[PDB]
Design a protein around this nucleic acid. Sequence first.
RNA 1: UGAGUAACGAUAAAGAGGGUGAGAAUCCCUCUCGCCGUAAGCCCAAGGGUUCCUACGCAAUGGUCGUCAGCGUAGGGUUAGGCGGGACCUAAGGUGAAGCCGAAAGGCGUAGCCGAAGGGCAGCCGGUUAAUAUUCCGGCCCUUCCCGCAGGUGCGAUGG
RNA 2: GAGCCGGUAGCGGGCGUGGAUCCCUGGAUGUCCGAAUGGGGGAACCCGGCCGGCGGGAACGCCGGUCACCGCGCUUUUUGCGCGGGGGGAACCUGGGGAACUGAAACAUCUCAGUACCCAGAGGAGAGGAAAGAGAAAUCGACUCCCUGAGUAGCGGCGAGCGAAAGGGGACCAGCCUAAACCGUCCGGCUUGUCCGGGCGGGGUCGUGGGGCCCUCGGACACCGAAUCCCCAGCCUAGCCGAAGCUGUUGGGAAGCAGCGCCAGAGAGGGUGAAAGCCCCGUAGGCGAAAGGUGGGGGGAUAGGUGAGGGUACCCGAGUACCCCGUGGUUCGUGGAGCCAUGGGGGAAUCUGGGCGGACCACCGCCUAAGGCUAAGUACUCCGGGUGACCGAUAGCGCACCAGUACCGUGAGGGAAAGGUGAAAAGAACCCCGGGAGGGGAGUGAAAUAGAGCCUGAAACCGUGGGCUUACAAGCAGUCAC
Lengths: 100, 62, 88, 92
Amino acid sequence: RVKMHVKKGDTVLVASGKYKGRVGKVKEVLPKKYAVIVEGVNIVKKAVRVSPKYPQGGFIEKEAPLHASKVRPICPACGKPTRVRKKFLENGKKIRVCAK
Amino acid sequence: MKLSEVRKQLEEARKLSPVELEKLVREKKRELMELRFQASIGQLSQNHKIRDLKRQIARLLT
Amino acid sequence: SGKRPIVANSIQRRGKAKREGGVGKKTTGISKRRQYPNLQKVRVRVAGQEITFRVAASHIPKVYELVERAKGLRLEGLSPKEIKKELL
Amino acid sequence: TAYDVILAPVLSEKAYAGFAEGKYTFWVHPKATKTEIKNAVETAFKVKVVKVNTLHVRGKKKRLGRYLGKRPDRKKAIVQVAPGQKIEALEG
RNA sequence: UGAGUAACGAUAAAGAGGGUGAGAAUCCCUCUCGCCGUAAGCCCAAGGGUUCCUACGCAAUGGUCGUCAGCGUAGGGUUAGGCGGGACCUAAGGUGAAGCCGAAAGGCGUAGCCGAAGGGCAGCCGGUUAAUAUUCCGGCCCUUCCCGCAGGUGCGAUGG
RNA sequence: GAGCCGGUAGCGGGCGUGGAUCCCUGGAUGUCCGAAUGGGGGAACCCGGCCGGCGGGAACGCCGGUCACCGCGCUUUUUGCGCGGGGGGAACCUGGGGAACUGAAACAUCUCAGUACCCAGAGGAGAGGAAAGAGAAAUCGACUCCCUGAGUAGCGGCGAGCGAAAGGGGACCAGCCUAAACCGUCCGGCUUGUCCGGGCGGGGUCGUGGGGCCCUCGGACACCGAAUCCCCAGCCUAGCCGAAGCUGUUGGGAAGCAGCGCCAGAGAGGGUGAAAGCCCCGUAGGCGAAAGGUGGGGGGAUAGGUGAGGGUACCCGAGUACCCCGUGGUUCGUGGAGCCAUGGGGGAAUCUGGGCGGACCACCGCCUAAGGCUAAGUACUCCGGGUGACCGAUAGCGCACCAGUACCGUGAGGGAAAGGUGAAAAGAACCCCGGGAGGGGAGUGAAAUAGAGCCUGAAACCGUGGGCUUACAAGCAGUCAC
Ligand SMILES: [Mg+2]
Ligand SMILES: [Mg+2]
Ligand SMILES: [Mg+2]
Ligand SMILES: [Mg+2]
Ligand SMILES: [Mg+2]
Ligand SMILES: [Mg+2]
Ligand SMILES: [Mg+2]
Ligand SMILES: [Mg+2]
Ligand SMILES: [Mg+2]
Ligand SMILES: [Mg+2]
Ligand SMILES: [Mg+2]
Ligand SMILES: [Mg+2]
Ligand SMILES: [Mg+2]
Ligand SMILES: [Mg+2]
Ligand SMILES: [Mg+2]
Ligand SMILES: [Mg+2]
Ligand SMILES: [Mg+2]
Ligand SMILES: [Mg+2]
Ligand SMILES: [Mg+2]
Ligand SMILES: [Mg+2]
Ligand SMILES: [Mg+2]
Ligand SMILES: [Mg+2]
Ligand SMILES: [Mg+2]
Ligand SMILES: [Mg+2]
Ligand SMILES: [Mg+2]
Ligand SMILES: [Mg+2]
Ligand SMILES: [Mg+2]
Ligand SMILES: [Mg+2]
Ligand SMILES: [Mg+2]
Ligand SMILES: [Mg+2]
Ligand SMILES: [Mg+2]
Ligand SMILES: [Mg+2]
Ligand SMILES: [Mg+2]
Ligand SMILES: [Mg+2]
Ligand SMILES: [Mg+2]
Ligand SMILES: [Mg+2]
Ligand SMILES: [Mg+2]
Ligand SMILES: [Mg+2]
Ligand SMILES: [Mg+2]
Ligand SMILES: [Mg+2]
Ligand SMILES: [Mg+2]
Ligand SMILES: [Mg+2]
Ligand SMILES: [Mg+2]
Ligand SMILES: [Mg+2]
Ligand SMILES: [Mg+2]
Ligand SMILES: [Mg+2]
Ligand SMILES: [Mg+2]
Ligand SMILES: [Mg+2]
Ligand SMILES: [Mg+2]
Ligand SMILES: [Mg+2]
Ligand SMILES: [Mg+2]
Ligand SMILES: [Mg+2]
Ligand SMILES: [Mg+2]
Ligand SMILES: [Mg+2]
Ligand SMILES: [Mg+2]
Ligand SMILES: [Mg+2]
Ligand SMILES: [Mg+2]
Ligand SMILES: [Mg+2]
Ligand SMILES: [Mg+2]
Ligand SMILES: [Mg+2]
Ligand SMILES: [Mg+2]
Ligand SMILES: [Mg+2]
Ligand SMILES: [Mg+2]
Ligand SMILES: [Mg+2]
Ligand SMILES: [Mg+2]
Ligand SMILES: [Mg+2]
Ligand SMILES: [Mg+2]
Ligand SMILES: [Mg+2]
Ligand SMILES: [Mg+2]
Ligand SMILES: [Mg+2]
Ligand SMILES: [Mg+2]
Ligand SMILES: [Mg+2]
Ligand SMILES: [Mg+2]
Ligand SMILES: [Mg+2]
Ligand SMILES: [Mg+2]
Ligand SMILES: [Mg+2]
Ligand SMILES: [Mg+2]
Ligand SMILES: [Mg+2]
Ligand SMILES: [Mg+2]
Ligand SMILES: [Mg+2]
Ligand SMILES: [Mg+2]
Ligand SMILES: [Mg+2]
Ligand SMILES: [Mg+2]
Ligand SMILES: [Mg+2]
Ligand SMILES: [Mg+2]
Ligand SMILES: [Mg+2]
Ligand SMILES: [Mg+2]
Ligand SMILES: [Mg+2]
Ligand SMILES: [Mg+2]
Ligand SMILES: [Mg+2]
Ligand SMILES: [Mg+2]
Ligand SMILES: [Mg+2]
Ligand SMILES: [Mg+2]
Ligand SMILES: [Mg+2]
Ligand SMILES: [Mg+2]
Ligand SMILES: [Mg+2]
Ligand SMILES: [Mg+2]
Ligand SMILES: [Mg+2]
Ligand SMILES: [Mg+2]
Ligand SMILES: [Mg+2]
Ligand SMILES: [Mg+2]
Ligand SMILES: [Mg+2]
Ligand SMILES: [Mg+2]
Ligand SMILES: [Mg+2]
Ligand SMILES: [Mg+2]
Ligand SMILES: [Mg+2]
Ligand SMILES: [Mg+2]
Ligand SMILES: [Mg+2]
Ligand SMILES: [Mg+2]
Ligand SMILES: [Mg+2]
Ligand SMILES: [Mg+2]
Ligand SMILES: [Mg+2]
Ligand SMILES: [Mg+2]
Ligand SMILES: [Mg+2]
Ligand SMILES: [Mg+2]
Ligand SMILES: [Mg+2]
Ligand SMILES: [Mg+2]
Ligand SMILES: [Mg+2]
Ligand SMILES: [Mg+2]
Ligand SMILES: [Mg+2]
Ligand SMILES: [Mg+2]
Ligand SMILES: [Mg+2]
Ligand SMILES: [Mg+2]
Ligand SMILES: [Mg+2]
Ligand SMILES: [Mg+2]
Ligand SMILES: [Mg+2]
Ligand SMILES: [Mg+2]
Ligand SMILES: [Mg+2]
Ligand SMILES: [Mg+2]
Ligand SMILES: [Mg+2]
Ligand SMILES: [Mg+2]
Ligand SMILES: [Mg+2]
Ligand SMILES: [Mg+2]
Ligand SMILES: [Mg+2]
Ligand SMILES: [Mg+2]
Ligand SMILES: [Mg+2]
Ligand SMILES: [Mg+2]
Ligand SMILES: [Mg+2]
Ligand SMILES: [Mg+2]
Ligand SMILES: [Mg+2]
Ligand SMILES: [Mg+2]
Ligand SMILES: [Mg+2]
Ligand SMILES: [Mg+2]
Ligand SMILES: [Mg+2]
Ligand SMILES: [Mg+2]
Ligand SMILES: [Mg+2]
Ligand SMILES: [Mg+2]
Ligand SMILES: [Mg+2]
Ligand SMILES: [Mg+2]
Ligand SMILES: [Mg+2]
Ligand SMILES: [Mg+2]
Ligand SMILES: [Mg+2]
Ligand SMILES: [Mg+2]
Ligand SMILES: [Mg+2]
Ligand SMILES: [Mg+2]
Ligand SMILES: [Mg+2]
Ligand SMILES: [Mg+2]
Ligand SMILES: [Mg+2]
Ligand SMILES: [Mg+2]
Ligand SMILES: [Mg+2]
Ligand SMILES: [Mg+2]
Ligand SMILES: [Mg+2]
Ligand SMILES: [Mg+2]
Ligand SMILES: [Mg+2]
Ligand SMILES: [Mg+2]
Ligand SMILES: [Mg+2]
Ligand SMILES: [Mg+2]
Ligand SMILES: [Mg+2]
Ligand SMILES: [Mg+2]
Ligand SMILES: [Mg+2]
Ligand SMILES: [Mg+2]
Ligand SMILES: [Mg+2]
Ligand SMILES: [Mg+2]
Ligand SMILES: [Mg+2]
Ligand SMILES: [Mg+2]
Ligand SMILES: [Mg+2]
Ligand SMILES: [Mg+2]
Ligand SMILES: [Mg+2]
Ligand SMILES: [Mg+2]
Ligand SMILES: [Mg+2]
Ligand SMILES: [Mg+2]
Ligand SMILES: [Mg+2]
Ligand SMILES: [Mg+2]
Ligand SMILES: [Mg+2]
Ligand SMILES: [Mg+2]
Ligand SMILES: [Mg+2]
Ligand SMILES: [Mg+2]
Ligand SMILES: [Mg+2]
Ligand SMILES: [Mg+2]
Ligand SMILES: [Mg+2]
Ligand SMILES: [Mg+2]
Ligand SMILES: [Mg+2]
Ligand SMILES: [Mg+2]
Ligand SMILES: [Mg+2]
Ligand SMILES: [Mg+2]
Ligand SMILES: [Mg+2]
Ligand SMILES: [Mg+2]
Ligand SMILES: [Mg+2]
Ligand SMILES: [Mg+2]
Ligand SMILES: [Mg+2]
Ligand SMILES: [Mg+2]
Ligand SMILES: [Mg+2]
Ligand SMILES: [Mg+2]
Ligand SMILES: [Mg+2]
Ligand SMILES: [Mg+2]
Ligand SMILES: [Mg+2]
Ligand SMILES: [Mg+2]
Ligand SMILES: [Mg+2]
Ligand SMILES: [Mg+2]
Ligand SMILES: [Mg+2]
Ligand SMILES: [Mg+2]
Ligand SMILES: [Mg+2]
Ligand SMILES: [Mg+2]
Ligand SMILES: [Mg+2]
Ligand SMILES: [Mg+2]
Ligand SMILES: [Mg+2]
Ligand SMILES: [Mg+2]
Ligand SMILES: [Mg+2]
Ligand SMILES: [Mg+2]
Ligand SMILES: [Mg+2]
Ligand SMILES: [Mg+2]
Ligand SMILES: [Mg+2]
Ligand SMILES: [Mg+2]
Ligand SMILES: [Mg+2]
């Protein structure tokens, strides 16, 4: 429980290190590790292939899990902290001034 | 989701229920005996089926 | 043991031997020792059947007093031990 | 609780070789009786069973890395089907 | 440090050719030689618990070496109405209704119950697997139990 | 309220806003062993009765149900049926038993100590508890716990040692039910009775003595009130809301430095590539339960309870009080030895009774024994939470780690060692020597003497290279001079 955090799968700004200011959508979020993948961090896995099945398996540069505290959600501006206003039924996150 | 549907059909299996469910499990335990055999020979099974079934049997048992 | 209407165990209380005057002094030697309750069997009738009581010598009478109260009592039923019991 | 006696067919050269005769053989519940084996294999493949042999298989004790362990025991059983008939299911 | 020292675990003993292999005194085969043979051979009981068999493999285990292995990984392997034990009996002992004893815990104890390498009980010869076999198969042979029949008789028990 | 199919990646294959995983509550299912409970037994196995079912099913097997012993009560003995016991729990508690070392500078009384330990039992506590009290005040007023009283009064081979109570200050606060006289009724017995007894109901509970019965008061609606009962508040077992920053600059990476600015009932603390009130998780303040648990705190009801006078002497806990013998408790070791308790012997009384105020006696006081129950204040920490001039892997629990393990012991029982790459796995493709291991290059990284039991990486110890020195020398290995 409570492992949950900032945004889910959507647009986000990177206030990290080697990718500060960068922007992208989050294509995965690993709560078990409190990190998310965007489109930013990319390292070279010279590795032949991960699992013995399939001959070729790639030098893939794929995106490295980014620590969830180095990414802020964003909407009609520069990404604000998340408030939560409950509607007349449910509840959804209003940014520092707008919806969604 | 699967639950929802399957479960209703069981107090629905109340037309001869107690008897019917019994009959039902019997076939269900068998459908799964088929699987455990097919999985045993290996190339002829794709997992989940077996657990989804095991679990069905159970709730159904109720 | 103690058992019956008696109600008396066996107390372990020491016996200390001494050498003395009382008009000059009095000195010692001391050891634990167990005092037993003088204890006898009591046989009695009570309707059919006999019935014994492993009682202390003190309350031997209490037992007869009990058979007297038993006359006012409704008993039988092949109750050898059972009488004693239902015999309060 | 009847398809629960027979667990799985045992796959071995030795087990296949038994197919020649009416001798089919498979893993069964460890607490299973030759008699309850019969009435089960019978009503699960519709065939008269004439004879049942059973035996336990002490599970081999393996170990992965520093962690030492044990595989589970099983009771293997070999059914003899009435002259003629056969279990197509095993015949693969 | 002693120190490349003592030791490498029975003085039954070795040699060679061929093969394998990255590597061979040390693994495989062959020939020669030697040792045991009331055993150093075979079979069963206890104990031991996969060490059995096969494939792959040598870092460590092996007092050297190691391609080998009782070692690592993996797969296979133990079939019974008659063999052994149990659904039979009782021994010493144990336990223990009844009964007795004991400050508590407990101690004793008839019947009974438990307790065997003793009593009782139906399988022999041969084949087959890498690996089981009075267990699978072949031949020949037998026991108990239930049902029915036919024949026979007072049948009937933890009691005598 | 977005992910999910534990630690645990991979092969393979699935699930989720038709609201999954996950968390809280309740229910279901729950193999065999264990109090172990049909019987057996070398726990985790073996064998069986009765009833119903499953298969061709009578032989066989399986499934569902059921069958231990013991106490108490209905059961007329009967055989039944019904409620209860059994076993476990770290410490704490009470009761039955109960040491020695050691101290006394030996040792026996004495001490250690009614401790250690064994046993039974109690339970969230346990024990104790409404005066046959204390003790000198013509005073106090259940019990328990703390302070004090006091190292006093005492006890003591007057050695070593041991060591009270009343009184005062606090915590807490609460009182009750029976036995008996007498009355009614059910049953038994027998020397039928105006009875004996057993059970059940009324009645009654005290020390200004109370109660019973009789007569007078009027005998009353009222008055008090639970420690039992009901509901509610509250609380616990999941959660939720929550203020305020952005730019530049050094850097592998800013949370640093600089610029300007913002919240604060919040500048506790943790994290994010380094040093952050304003990025994340929080914190202040506040919000929350369908279900289980708890719950006089508040509220309500029932049980229960409450008066005066006069007369009669019925009753007022028995092998008991009481004295004696043997002991234990107390500060009290036989001491002038009382008090409380009690193994043996003798053995009363019912208020004109009986106990006590340290032998005894008198006087004067206090108190009502031989039936029972009772909350809180107290003790403990298995468990959850909070906090530290507590530890930081030879410390801290034996265990930070897959430890009561590995290993040792027949067994009781003994009992270890072992934590750290990196911000990230980016964990080193591919080539090169090699059978492999392991190297060299390539590549990732801020860093690879961070390269995988990998942070730092000390000392002993082993080694290559370099400088100076040594084969006519006499030695605590240094020291002084050249
Ligand atoms: Mg989104
Ligand atoms: Mg490639
Ligand atoms: Mg923008
Ligand atoms: Mg139907
Ligand atoms: Mg159908
Ligand atoms: Mg059901
Ligand atoms: Mg006796
Ligand atoms: Mg006595
Ligand atoms: Mg006793
Ligand atoms: Mg004496
Ligand atoms: Mg004298
Ligand atoms: Mg003396
Ligand atoms: Mg002594
Ligand atoms: Mg002594
Ligand atoms: Mg006599
Ligand atoms: Mg008797
Ligand atoms: Mg007497
Ligand atoms: Mg009487
Ligand atoms: Mg009787
Ligand atoms: Mg009788
Ligand atoms: Mg009795
Ligand atoms: Mg009765
Ligand atoms: Mg094969
Ligand atoms: Mg075969
Ligand atoms: Mg046939
Ligand atoms: Mg047969
Ligand atoms: Mg067998
Ligand atoms: Mg093995
Ligand atoms: Mg050396
Ligand atoms: Mg040499
Ligand atoms: Mg040499
Ligand atoms: Mg030498
Ligand atoms: Mg020499
Ligand atoms: Mg030598
Ligand atoms: Mg030697
Ligand atoms: Mg030698
Ligand atoms: Mg050669
Ligand atoms: Mg080779
Ligand atoms: Mg070669
Ligand atoms: Mg050669
Ligand atoms: Mg040779
Ligand atoms: Mg070889
Ligand atoms: Mg010879
Ligand atoms: Mg000879
Ligand atoms: Mg034998
Ligand atoms: Mg092995
Ligand atoms: Mg082969
Ligand atoms: Mg093969
Ligand atoms: Mg080989
Ligand atoms: Mg090797
Ligand atoms: Mg070697
Ligand atoms: Mg070879
Ligand atoms: Mg092997
Ligand atoms: Mg024979
Ligand atoms: Mg047999
Ligand atoms: Mg037997
Ligand atoms: Mg036997
Ligand atoms: Mg016998
Ligand atoms: Mg005997
Ligand atoms: Mg006993
Ligand atoms: Mg007893
Ligand atoms: Mg005995
Ligand atoms: Mg035995
Ligand atoms: Mg026997
Ligand atoms: Mg025998
Ligand atoms: Mg024999
Ligand atoms: Mg024969
Ligand atoms: Mg034969
Ligand atoms: Mg013969
Ligand atoms: Mg063999
Ligand atoms: Mg045969
Ligand atoms: Mg006859
Ligand atoms: Mg006759
Ligand atoms: Mg006869
Ligand atoms: Mg999740
Ligand atoms: Mg997963
Ligand atoms: Mg897993
Ligand atoms: Mg997985
Ligand atoms: Mg995975
Ligand atoms: Mg996977
Ligand atoms: Mg996959
Ligand atoms: Mg989750
Ligand atoms: Mg999860
Ligand atoms: Mg639950
Ligand atoms: Mg079930
Ligand atoms: Mg059992
Ligand atoms: Mg039972
Ligand atoms: Mg038993
Ligand atoms: Mg039946
Ligand atoms: Mg049947
Ligand atoms: Mg059951
Ligand atoms: Mg049964
Ligand atoms: Mg008995
Ligand atoms: Mg009983
Ligand atoms: Mg009752
Ligand atoms: Mg009864
Ligand atoms: Mg009744
Ligand atoms: Mg009655
Ligand atoms: Mg009865
Ligand atoms: Mg009747
Ligand atoms: Mg009866
Ligand atoms: Mg019964
Ligand atoms: Mg009975
Ligand atoms: Mg009842
Ligand atoms: Mg209890
Ligand atoms: Mg208990
Ligand atoms: Mg005591
Ligand atoms: Mg005691
Ligand atoms: Mg001594
Ligand atoms: Mg001495
Ligand atoms: Mg003492
Ligand atoms: Mg004690
Ligand atoms: Mg007892
Ligand atoms: Mg207990
Ligand atoms: Mg209490
Ligand atoms: Mg009490
Ligand atoms: Mg009183
Ligand atoms: Mg003392
Ligand atoms: Mg002291
Ligand atoms: Mg005091
Ligand atoms: Mg006081
Ligand atoms: Mg006070
Ligand atoms: Mg306080
Ligand atoms: Mg008071
Ligand atoms: Mg009466
Ligand atoms: Mg009575
Ligand atoms: Mg009465
Ligand atoms: Mg009454
Ligand atoms: Mg009353
Ligand atoms: Mg009154
Ligand atoms: Mg009173
Ligand atoms: Mg009066
Ligand atoms: Mg009246
Ligand atoms: Mg009137
Ligand atoms: Mg009145
Ligand atoms: Mg009350
Ligand atoms: Mg809360
Ligand atoms: Mg909760
Ligand atoms: Mg919300
Ligand atoms: Mg915030
Ligand atoms: Mg700032
Ligand atoms: Mg610039
Ligand atoms: Mg600058
Ligand atoms: Mg830069
Ligand atoms: Mg910045
Ligand atoms: Mg600075
Ligand atoms: Mg503002
Ligand atoms: Mg904290
Ligand atoms: Mg700072
Ligand atoms: Mg900070
Ligand atoms: Mg709050
Ligand atoms: Mg509420
Ligand atoms: Mg509600
Ligand atoms: Mg309260
Ligand atoms: Mg009333
Ligand atoms: Mg009144
Ligand atoms: Mg009067
Ligand atoms: Mg009188
Ligand atoms: Mg009495
Ligand atoms: Mg008397
Ligand atoms: Mg009297
Ligand atoms: Mg008398
Ligand atoms: Mg006396
Ligand atoms: Mg008196
Ligand atoms: Mg006196
Ligand atoms: Mg005497
Ligand atoms: Mg004397
Ligand atoms: Mg005395
Ligand atoms: Mg004592
Ligand atoms: Mg004394
Ligand atoms: Mg003292
Ligand atoms: Mg004393
Ligand atoms: Mg005294
Ligand atoms: Mg006295
Ligand atoms: Mg006495
Ligand atoms: Mg007295
Ligand atoms: Mg006094
Ligand atoms: Mg005086
Ligand atoms: Mg007094
Ligand atoms: Mg009193
Ligand atoms: Mg009295
Ligand atoms: Mg009283
Ligand atoms: Mg009292
Ligand atoms: Mg009392
Ligand atoms: Mg109490
Ligand atoms: Mg406290
Ligand atoms: Mg704690
Ligand atoms: Mg804490
Ligand atoms: Mg703290
Ligand atoms: Mg600290
Ligand atoms: Mg360490
Ligand atoms: Mg440690
Ligand atoms: Mg360290
Ligand atoms: Mg260490
Ligand atoms: Mg601990
Ligand atoms: Mg622990
Ligand atoms: Mg482990
Ligand atoms: Mg552990
Ligand atoms: Mg551990
Ligand atoms: Mg370990
Ligand atoms: Mg271990
Ligand atoms: Mg050993
Ligand atoms: Mg051992
Ligand atoms: Mg060590
Ligand atoms: Mg470790
Ligand atoms: Mg990876
Ligand atoms: Mg390399
Ligand atoms: Mg190449
Ligand atoms: Mg090569
Ligand atoms: Mg190569
Ligand atoms: Mg390497
Ligand atoms: Mg390499
Ligand atoms: Mg390189
Ligand atoms: Mg680089
Ligand atoms: Mg730098
Ligand atoms: Mg470094
Ligand atoms: Mg290493
Ligand atoms: Mg570090
Ligand atoms: Mg050198
Ligand atoms: Mg040199
Ligand atoms: Mg130099
Ligand atoms: Mg030089
Ligand atoms: Mg010299
Ligand atoms: Mg010199």
